[PDB]
Amino acid sequence: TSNFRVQPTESIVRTNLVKNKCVNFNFNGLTGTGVLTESNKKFLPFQQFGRDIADTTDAVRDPQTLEILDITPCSFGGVSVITPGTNTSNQVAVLYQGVNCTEVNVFQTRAGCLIGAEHVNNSYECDIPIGAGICASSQSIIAYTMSLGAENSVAYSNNSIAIPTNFTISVTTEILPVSMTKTSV
Amino acid sequence: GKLQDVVNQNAQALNTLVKQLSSNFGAISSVLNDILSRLDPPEAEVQIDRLITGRLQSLQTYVTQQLIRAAEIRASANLAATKMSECVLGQSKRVDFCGKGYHLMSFPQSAPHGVVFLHVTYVPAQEKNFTTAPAICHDGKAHFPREGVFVSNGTHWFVTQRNFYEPQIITTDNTFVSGNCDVVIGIVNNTV
Amino acid sequence: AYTNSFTRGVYYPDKVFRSSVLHSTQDLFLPFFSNVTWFHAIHDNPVLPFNDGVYFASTEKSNIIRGWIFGTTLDSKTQSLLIVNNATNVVIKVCEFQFCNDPFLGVNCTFEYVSFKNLREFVFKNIDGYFKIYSKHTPINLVRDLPQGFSALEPLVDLPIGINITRFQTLLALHAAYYVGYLQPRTFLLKYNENGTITDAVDCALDPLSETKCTLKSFTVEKGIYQTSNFRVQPTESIVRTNLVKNKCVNFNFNGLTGTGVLTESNKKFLPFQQFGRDIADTTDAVRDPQTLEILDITPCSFGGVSVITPGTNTSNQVAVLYQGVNCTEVNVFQTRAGCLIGAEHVNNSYECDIPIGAGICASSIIAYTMSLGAENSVAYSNNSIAIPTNFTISVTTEILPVSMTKTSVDCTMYICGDSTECSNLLLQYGSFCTQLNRALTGIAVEQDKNTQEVFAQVKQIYKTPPIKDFGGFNFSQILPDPSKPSKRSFIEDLLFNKVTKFNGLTVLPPLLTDEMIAQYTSALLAGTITSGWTFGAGAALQIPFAMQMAYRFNGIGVTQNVLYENQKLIANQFNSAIGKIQDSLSSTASALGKLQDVVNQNAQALNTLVKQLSSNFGAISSVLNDILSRLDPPEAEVQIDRLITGRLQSLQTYVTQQLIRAAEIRASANLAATKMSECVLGQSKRVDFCGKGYHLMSFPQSAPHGVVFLHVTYVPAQEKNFTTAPAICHDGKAHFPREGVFVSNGTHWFVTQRNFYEPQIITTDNTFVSGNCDVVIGIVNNTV
């Protein structure tokens, strides 16, 4: 449906310094967006910033106190909606992709934060794929780890055989596209 | 749904081109008539260049996507041609190519922008349990089965084919001698 | 005199902390293994030049050389810098000084700062007149020259004086040598440690091995061919129509038109008013001249791509420099069809090709030779000569097929626009590019999940192996799963997973299936194979002992099953030995998984390329939206935001198109893997060289990073023998023919045998049928039937 985005809360003009939250920082004219938690990177006295492989600002040096504050930008993702048929129900479930549930029947999975679903601990065949192993499906939306299939143990002795005694002729339908519509512009 | 999806992607791309005709791509208007009816040529040249760049990029994108999709449909078409030749005109042995099961026939029917096969497949469905033996020793000489398996019902030993239960009596016609018993693991001692 | 300054004088380029990364820059530096002037102090300070900055290093045992004099003429007519340091006090001034004739510290002011065994390095370099100093002190034990070592330099003084310097002189102390070099605009590939300190460097424009290493962005290279640059012949002089010369690369100017080529003269049919001949793309093949009449044609200067042949850097450091499509008279020199082969020596032998050069030449001291395609053999063909094998060899072949990619989704608004509004407005003005792009990427992700499902989910019923392993004598303990691991796998699967290894809108979605599920599928397929055979893919599963299963799989390639039931111990041992060889290969060779590693490397390289494309300026004044918007007026800025939108939109369209071709490639591989699974794993194929080289027997899957691995078990025969044959036999005038197999002889007796494993029987009425007469068929021998 859309893209989930966390917003900052205040502007830091360097006023004071705050930590562990999404904030806007203004250090001698340069802006940005991230979490100004402090770190312990090596500080050679001439150096100011740290950078990764792809040349993006990670750390920063405060112009008053000599400390290094690494930056982790605000979380984001795409909101995704699980829906049954409108002839059946009108209930939904709003997944947040790759977002921990402390950032939004809240249930947390490695695919993301899933809200409008139950957590049945049984195993059925898969209906609507959520991701990373679980998939969704008396009007209660449930979420459960999918069952791959039934389980069987073949009676393998060293003198045991099975032979069929009756058959079943089957007819299978296979559909293959062959062409589009011939078009010119 | 496959053929419907092909129709839907083609119609969606064709509609998308018309929506980009309705787009603007940075100019002050989306129509050459209102561009030319008011503006002088030294500025109309720049604006029409903007529209040309936009629509030419759009049409190039459309043709590239058609080329990739046509490659996809060409792969499907060659697969359909091969499958016609092997399944329709003959009896294949490549398993799970002409349908799940031991395939034995096929029939085509036409369909919008495609083909439909009706794969007729033998399947077995009702099973039992029996006791086997890799060979059978009678006079110290091992006998082996030509085609099929060796089975028993607790008291007598029978030979049948591998794929439909129909047992016969052990005679010289269905078993051949291949030497000595002592090398083969699993030998039993019934009469041949 | 003069001496060799090996590596010293490398400083810190900028003030950005970096760790565990190789970085390339471009600025002035002292080159590597060059000549730097060496001085003395006994029994020495003239006015040395100041070209572009000085690497100065005074090895001190007594602290004599202490200060410097900077300026243009040293005579109090410009602002001259004077630095004095009596080992405690640092003095810097910008006054005007009337210096001495041979100045040494014997034993208009606007700025002032006041604070053998050793070595004291410097870089007195200047940018825009802004005087900069680097320094580093270190203790040594040396008496003669500079030590052979590496030491990074950090900036101590940065002075905004804006002074153009031409002359500088040191300062003695009369009651320790020093060196002066110069800087060149090279490029370097540095190496930081985890503490942010430079550990090594590579001078890019020194030798072809350094060019190759600077291109590959690494210090250790592999054996192969790596294109380094483009060879280009330069002209020498300009012809203005003065005089005219031929057979040379020259510049020619004729009434205002320029060019580059060879002005050799020819016999083009001039028609009395014509001037030029012309090629297609507005390039003149021929030309005439205004001072006289003469027709002369044009041929441009030769060019090509400089290619470098390099062996393993853990074996040698000598190279070879191939020039492509260039004759060796315009570059031990060797000439071949691919081009000039400066570096290696021609050899008149032929071996297996190692490093392919082109047109039949393969490189490998370093030799060059025409490749030997293979060994030679003359088959002893006759009209009564046959060969039957007498002993076989079970083989196990490893085949690796990529099946899946990594799902990705890149939103246009966050990519092109960084948290902006004017950018979003203009990107809405450009249309539906975003929706079509995300639709394409979502289609890629969905079809990758479909690829994985189609390859693996083909059983629909998980089977389990019995606790008792009575499998005839075979041993599947290394492929069967291991319950001891926290994530259940097997030994070979763990070895395979052991080998293969942001915040701009780029996200990575996980696969729907997990590795435990894919391993559950693989173990279900394998347990179904072992305990049932081919039957579990048609309908339901069956029970068959494993000896019986392999006996029927010999009858599926022509060999009678009593071979198995009399050789099963040998076949079991040789299968187990082949399994152990698979372990040894997968534990001591890394080149096997190159397909999957290449897929991972191309995907990561494309993503990284897109992220570095975020930094490209694309024609504007800056590469950051925040600093674009923080300065420019709203009428001014929108052109520059449009330029960046065009650049990143083109980049993202290129990325998605390349993703589309690559996804088509992976899809073809995935369908091929699905067909392999069905035909090879669930059954016994007869398509030659599809399920392994030789007569195919079985196959076993194992999971792998974004792929699958097959272990094709294959019969191969190995030990031949020569016999004498005959198309038929006549006994009572009636021709006898063989039902199955060849009809052979040792030299005294005639026997009938199987076509594919030597085991002869006695000729009776039960293995030969009567058909025809003697006369029509060529080759009948006479023997009792």
Side-chain angles (χ1 to χ4, degrees):
Chain A
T1 42
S2 190
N3 267 345
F4 162 65
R5 182 197 286 164
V6 194
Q7 293 324 80
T9 180
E10 58 185 359
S11 66
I12 291 306
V13 184
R14 192 157 268 280
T15 71
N16 266 292
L17 191 140
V18 298
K19 291 204 213 156
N20 291 110
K21 56 210 292 169
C22 275
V23 287
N24 160 270
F25 63 93
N26 194 352
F27 277 62
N28 297 313
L30 62 85
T31 69
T33 293
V35 182
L36 307 167
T37 186
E38 68 158 351
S39 65
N40 50 353
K41 286 169 178 154
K42 177 59 193 162
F43 188 61
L44 260 62
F46 55 95
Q47 277 174 353
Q48 305 281 149
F49 324 111
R51 281 191 161 151
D52 47 342
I53 301 169
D55 270 340
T56 44
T57 318
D58 291 332
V60 66
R61 208 271 301 262
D62 191 288
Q64 311 263 40
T65 178
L66 265 67
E67 53 169 353
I68 292 172
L69 295 93
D70 57 341
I71 303 196
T72 311
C74 297
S75 187
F76 55 88
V79 295
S80 180
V81 169
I82 298 172
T83 309
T86 46
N87 61 332
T88 308
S89 169
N90 296 326
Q91 295 183 353
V92 299
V94 192
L95 189 153
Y96 287 70
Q97 282 269 25
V99 177
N100 196 358
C101 285
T102 70
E103 281 98 308
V104 298
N105 199 9
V106 168
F107 168 52
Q108 160 80 36
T109 198
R110 45 179 82 185
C113 194
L114 184 62
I115 294 179
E118 207 62 33
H119 187 273
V120 178
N121 281 22
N122 286 319
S123 52
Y124 317 130
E125 294 294 328
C126 194
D127 213 348
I128 301 177
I130 296 169
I134 62 170
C135 71
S137 174
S138 69
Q139 197 52 50
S140 53
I141 301 189
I142 62 175
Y144 69 105
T145 287
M146 61 165 98
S147 167
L148 312 174
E151 205 155 335
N152 186 9
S153 57
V154 191
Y156 184 110
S157 164
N158 52 284
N159 48 2
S160 175
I161 207 175
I163 297 164
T165 59
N166 189 297
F167 50 90
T168 175
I169 292 307
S170 178
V171 165
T172 317
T173 290
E174 184 184 358
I175 293 165
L176 281 164
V178 166
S179 67
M180 42 205 78
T181 72
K182 322 214 298 194
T183 313
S184 66
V185 182
Chain B
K2 306 180 215 213
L3 309 157
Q4 204 76 46
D5 278 357
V6 178
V7 177
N8 278 128
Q9 309 183 250
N10 285 315
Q12 205 75 11
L14 294 174
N15 204 266
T16 311
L17 294 174
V18 187
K19 309 199 292 285
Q20 312 264 20
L21 298 174
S22 66
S23 294
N24 180 37
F25 293 113
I28 74 179
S29 184
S30 173
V31 289
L32 270 51
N33 289 319
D34 274 10
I35 278 153
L36 294 174
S37 63
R38 195 251 162 277
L39 284 192
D40 300 340
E43 293 143 316
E45 62 181 2
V46 181
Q47 304 278 352
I48 297 169
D49 289 6
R50 303 214 204 172
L51 280 74
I52 290 156
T53 315
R55 306 196 214 242
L56 181 49
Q57 201 168 357
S58 304
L59 202 173
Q60 183 69 241
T61 302
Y62 173 55
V63 175
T64 317
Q65 297 251 20
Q66 291 298 110
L67 273 154
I68 303 160
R69 212 175 282 125
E72 293 179 353
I73 298 289
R74 186 169 55 234
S76 197
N78 296 115
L79 174 47
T82 307
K83 187 179 289 293
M84 180 79 73
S85 302
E86 304 214 31
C87 305
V88 182
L89 276 78
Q91 202 189 16
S92 189
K93 274 192 191 43
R94 318 169 48 186
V95 299
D96 299 5
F97 196 46
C98 311
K100 283 200 67 161
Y102 297 155
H103 164 264
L104 78 171
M105 293 189 85
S106 290
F107 309 117
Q109 314 283 306
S110 53
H113 290 278
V115 63
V116 165
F117 301 84
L118 307 197
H119 308 284
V120 173
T121 52
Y122 185 83
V123 171
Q126 279 169 32
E127 309 161 351
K128 276 182 68 67
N129 290 333
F130 304 85
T131 290
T132 54
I136 287 185
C137 297
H138 168 53
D139 187 74
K141 325 178 261 182
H143 309 253
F144 290 68
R146 306 216 206 234
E147 289 180 3
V149 299
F150 266 103
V151 304
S152 88
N153 66 333
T155 50
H156 301 81
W157 279 93
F158 289 144
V159 54
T160 193
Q161 75 212 250
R162 279 142 70 152
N163 214 356
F164 189 94
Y165 180 74
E166 198 271 318
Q168 293 104 60
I169 285 173
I170 308 294
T171 61
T172 77
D173 291 331
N174 201 7
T175 43
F176 64 89
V177 182
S178 168
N180 56 353
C181 284
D182 296 320
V183 190
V184 176
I185 316 167
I187 49 169
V188 308
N189 287 317
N190 207 8
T191 305
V192 167
Chain C
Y2 303 97
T3 191
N4 203 17
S5 84
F6 317 110
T7 48
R8 309 187 72 84
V10 186
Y11 52 70
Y12 283 103
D14 44 14
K15 319 161 170 69
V16 163
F17 174 100
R18 299 188 184 82
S19 79
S20 293
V21 62
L22 314 175
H23 173 65
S24 312
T25 182
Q26 176 198 9
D27 71 335
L28 291 63
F29 267 117
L30 185 88
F32 271 34
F33 294 80
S34 58
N35 265 6
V36 160
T37 315
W38 169 42
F39 287 75
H40 306 276
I42 48 159
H43 282 285
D44 209 10
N45 48 3
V47 190
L48 265 289
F50 184 82
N51 308 335
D52 304 294
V54 170
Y55 167 78
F56 179 79
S58 77
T59 66
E60 296 276 358
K61 78 177 191 174
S62 50
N63 217 29
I64 291 295
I65 315 302
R66 300 172 199 171
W68 295 267
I69 284 164
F70 277 68
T72 72
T73 45
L74 297 84
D75 64 337
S76 184
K77 285 165 198 159
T78 191
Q79 279 73 236
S80 173
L81 159 69
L82 179 48
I83 297 177
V84 193
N85 178 38
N86 54 0
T88 46
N89 309 348
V90 174
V91 180
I92 301 173
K93 276 181 175 174
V94 290
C95 311
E96 296 209 9
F97 304 91
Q98 185 80 86
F99 287 113
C100 298
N101 270 341
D102 194 358
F104 52 83
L105 187 76
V107 180
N108 305 1
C109 302
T110 50
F111 163 70
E112 168 177 10
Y113 158 70
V114 165
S115 277
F116 317 124
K117 305 283 188 165
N118 315 286
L119 182 51
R120 183 169 296 127
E121 290 182 350
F122 293 111
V123 177
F124 293 103
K125 97 169 200 176
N126 265 276
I127 300 176
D128 299 332
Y130 283 64
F131 178 63
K132 298 185 185 291
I133 314 177
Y134 295 84
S135 176
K136 176 61 63 190
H137 303 179
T138 180
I140 50 167
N141 287 318
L142 201 62
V143 68
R144 163 203 61 249
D145 211 6
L146 293 166
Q148 203 166 20
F150 182 67
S151 192
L153 271 52
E154 68 274 16
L156 279 182
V157 192
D158 204 337
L159 278 188
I161 69 175
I163 289 192
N164 179 50
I165 320 174
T166 58
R167 280 176 171 79
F168 89 101
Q169 195 152 24
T170 63
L171 289 171
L172 281 157
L174 297 205
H175 306 268
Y178 55 93
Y179 305 74
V180 169
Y182 293 97
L183 309 162
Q184 288 213 24
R186 313 300 201 105
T187 57
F188 286 92
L189 188 153
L190 307 168
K191 179 173 183 168
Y192 301 77
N193 58 355
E194 77 264 15
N195 297 348
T197 308
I198 301 177
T199 74
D200 205 356
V202 161
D203 185 19
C204 288
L206 186 72
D207 62 358
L209 194 46
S210 302
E211 296 161 5
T212 306
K213 286 181 189 185
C214 279
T215 311
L216 287 184
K217 295 250 188 288
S218 160
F219 273 60
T220 61
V221 304
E222 260 284 347
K223 164 162 58 61
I225 295 184
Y226 312 95
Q227 167 148 5
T228 45
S229 196
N230 284 337
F231 169 60
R232 193 154 326 283
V233 182
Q234 293 314 90
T236 180
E237 58 185 359
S238 72
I239 290 312
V240 178
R241 285 261 211 191
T242 75
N243 266 309
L244 172 153
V245 291
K246 320 207 211 312
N247 296 85
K248 296 179 53 191
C249 274
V250 289
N251 187 358
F252 63 94
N253 193 354
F254 281 76
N255 302 310
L257 63 88
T258 63
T260 285
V262 180
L263 300 172
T264 186
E265 59 98 22
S266 49
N267 43 43
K268 184 213 76 186
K269 189 267 290 182
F270 57 99
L271 192 153
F273 85 112
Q274 279 182 350
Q275 274 70 238
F276 324 111
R278 293 177 65 88
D279 209 44
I280 316 309
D282 292 331
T283 46
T284 61
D285 187 15
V287 67
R288 276 184 163 260
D289 42 355
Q291 296 287 331
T292 178
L293 72 164
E294 176 63 28
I295 174 62
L296 60 86
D297 70 290
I298 320 293
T299 302
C301 298
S302 184
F303 56 90
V306 172
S307 158
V308 170
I309 305 105
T310 295
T313 198
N314 310 348
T315 313
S316 161
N317 302 310
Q318 204 171 9
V319 304
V321 191
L322 195 159
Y323 293 76
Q324 293 179 356
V326 179
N327 195 0
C328 294
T329 72
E330 58 185 1
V331 299
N332 216 1
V333 176
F334 182 44
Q335 160 84 47
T336 187
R337 308 183 182 183
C340 205
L341 196 39
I342 284 162
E345 54 161 321
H346 191 200
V347 167
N348 283 36
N349 290 318
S350 78
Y351 314 126
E352 158 170 359
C353 178
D354 213 348
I355 309 169
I357 276 172
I361 299 322
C362 294
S364 186
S365 53
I366 290 185
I367 57 178
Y369 62 101
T370 300
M371 65 183 73
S372 172
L373 311 167
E376 304 265 329
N377 189 3
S378 71
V379 189
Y381 182 76
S382 160
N383 52 286
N384 53 3
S385 169
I386 207 174
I388 298 163
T390 61
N391 188 296
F392 50 91
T393 175
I394 295 308
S395 177
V396 164
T397 315
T398 290
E399 182 186 1
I400 295 165
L401 269 157
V403 164
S404 172
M405 298 175 37
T406 64
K407 310 155 45 154
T408 307
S409 47
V410 181
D411 65 332
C412 67
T413 300
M414 195 43 91
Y415 186 100
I416 296 89
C417 314
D419 312 321
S420 287
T421 52
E422 309 97 310
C423 184
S424 283
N425 291 353
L426 302 177
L427 164 64
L428 291 174
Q429 275 195 337
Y430 283 39
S432 176
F433 284 137
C434 291
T435 304
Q436 207 191 339
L437 272 163
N438 303 127
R439 182 157 32 242
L441 283 168
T442 307
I444 295 151
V446 174
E447 66 183 1
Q448 296 294 321
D449 276 319
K450 184 178 184 293
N451 290 358
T452 309
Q453 196 96 44
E454 191 45 60
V455 182
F456 285 111
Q458 294 180 358
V459 56
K460 291 174 71 175
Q461 172 88 37
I462 297 89
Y463 301 85
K464 301 278 158 203
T465 300
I468 308 154
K469 321 299 200 66
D470 199 8
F471 296 156
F474 290 72
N475 191 336
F476 309 89
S477 86
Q478 318 288 332
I479 43 177
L480 277 168
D482 211 0
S484 298
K485 314 256 187 74
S487 167
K488 281 178 182 180
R489 283 206 270 269
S490 65
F491 201 44
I492 294 163
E493 299 196 60
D494 214 11
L495 306 179
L496 291 153
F497 291 172
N498 270 320
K499 290 207 176 299
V500 194
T501 53
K502 206 201 172 174
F503 297 102
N504 299 293
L506 277 79
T507 68
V508 174
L509 321 183
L512 165 81
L513 302 99
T514 59
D515 292 272
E516 301 88 61
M517 301 165 168
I518 307 174
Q520 274 188 69
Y521 281 155
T522 304
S523 63
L525 277 155
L526 180 39
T529 309
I530 300 165
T531 61
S532 54
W534 59 102
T535 81
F536 83 100
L542 206 76
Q543 292 94 23
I544 191 67
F546 209 86
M548 302 215 178
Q549 167 176 359
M550 299 301 273
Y552 294 164
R553 298 193 163 222
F554 290 176
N555 278 25
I557 67 167
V559 191
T560 290
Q561 49 189 15
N562 63 350
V563 170
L564 181 67
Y565 289 162
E566 271 145 29
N567 288 27
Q568 40 179 339
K569 292 190 284 183
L570 200 154
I571 307 155
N573 291 130
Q574 182 170 176
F575 178 48
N576 296 312
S577 303
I579 297 169
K581 294 175 187 180
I582 301 299
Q583 323 204 350
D584 300 331
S585 178
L586 281 169
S587 200
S588 81
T589 292
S591 55
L593 268 68
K595 296 184 202 190
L596 321 184
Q597 203 77 47
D598 279 353
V599 176
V600 177
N601 277 309
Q602 297 180 252
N603 284 316
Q605 184 176 110
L607 294 174
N608 198 261
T609 300
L610 184 63
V611 184
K612 324 192 291 283
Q613 283 283 20
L614 291 183
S615 49
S616 284
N617 178 41
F618 283 116
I621 67 182
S622 179
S623 170
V624 285
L625 258 59
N626 296 133
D627 280 287
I628 277 161
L629 294 174
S630 65
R631 174 164 154 283
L632 299 162
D633 300 342
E636 299 290 331
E638 54 157 349
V639 177
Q640 282 90 328
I641 296 89
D642 281 343
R643 295 206 211 182
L644 279 74
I645 290 159
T646 300
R648 324 221 201 191
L649 182 48
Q650 205 172 351
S651 304
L652 202 173
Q653 183 64 240
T654 302
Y655 170 57
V656 175
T657 315
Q658 273 264 30
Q659 278 314 300
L660 280 160
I661 296 90
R662 212 172 282 128
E665 293 179 353
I666 302 291
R667 184 170 56 234
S669 199
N671 303 127
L672 174 54
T675 313
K676 290 252 178 202
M677 182 73 76
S678 314
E679 304 214 31
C680 298
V681 182
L682 279 75
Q684 200 188 18
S685 188
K686 285 183 198 228
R687 312 170 53 184
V688 173
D689 297 5
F690 200 44
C691 307
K693 286 205 52 161
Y695 300 155
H696 165 262
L697 270 182
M698 289 183 108
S699 293
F700 306 121
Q702 311 286 305
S703 61
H706 289 82
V708 64
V709 159
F710 301 84
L711 308 197
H712 311 280
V713 167
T714 312
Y715 188 103
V716 170
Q719 284 166 27
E720 303 97 42
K721 207 176 171 199
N722 296 336
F723 301 86
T724 291
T725 43
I729 310 160
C730 280
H731 169 61
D732 291 331
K734 320 175 270 169
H736 302 73
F737 289 67
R739 280 192 196 148
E740 260 177 28
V742 300
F743 167 62
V744 290
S745 174
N746 53 0
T748 48
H749 283 267
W750 280 102
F751 286 139
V752 64
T753 195
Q754 154 177 8
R755 190 196 307 194
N756 213 358
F757 184 96
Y758 177 68
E759 181 255 320
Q761 293 104 240
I762 300 299
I763 298 168
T764 61
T765 81
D766 291 331
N767 50 7
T768 49
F769 66 87
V770 177
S771 173
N773 52 345
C774 299
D775 291 331
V776 193
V777 63
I778 299 168
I780 287 179
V781 306
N782 273 277
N783 201 359
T784 309
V785 164

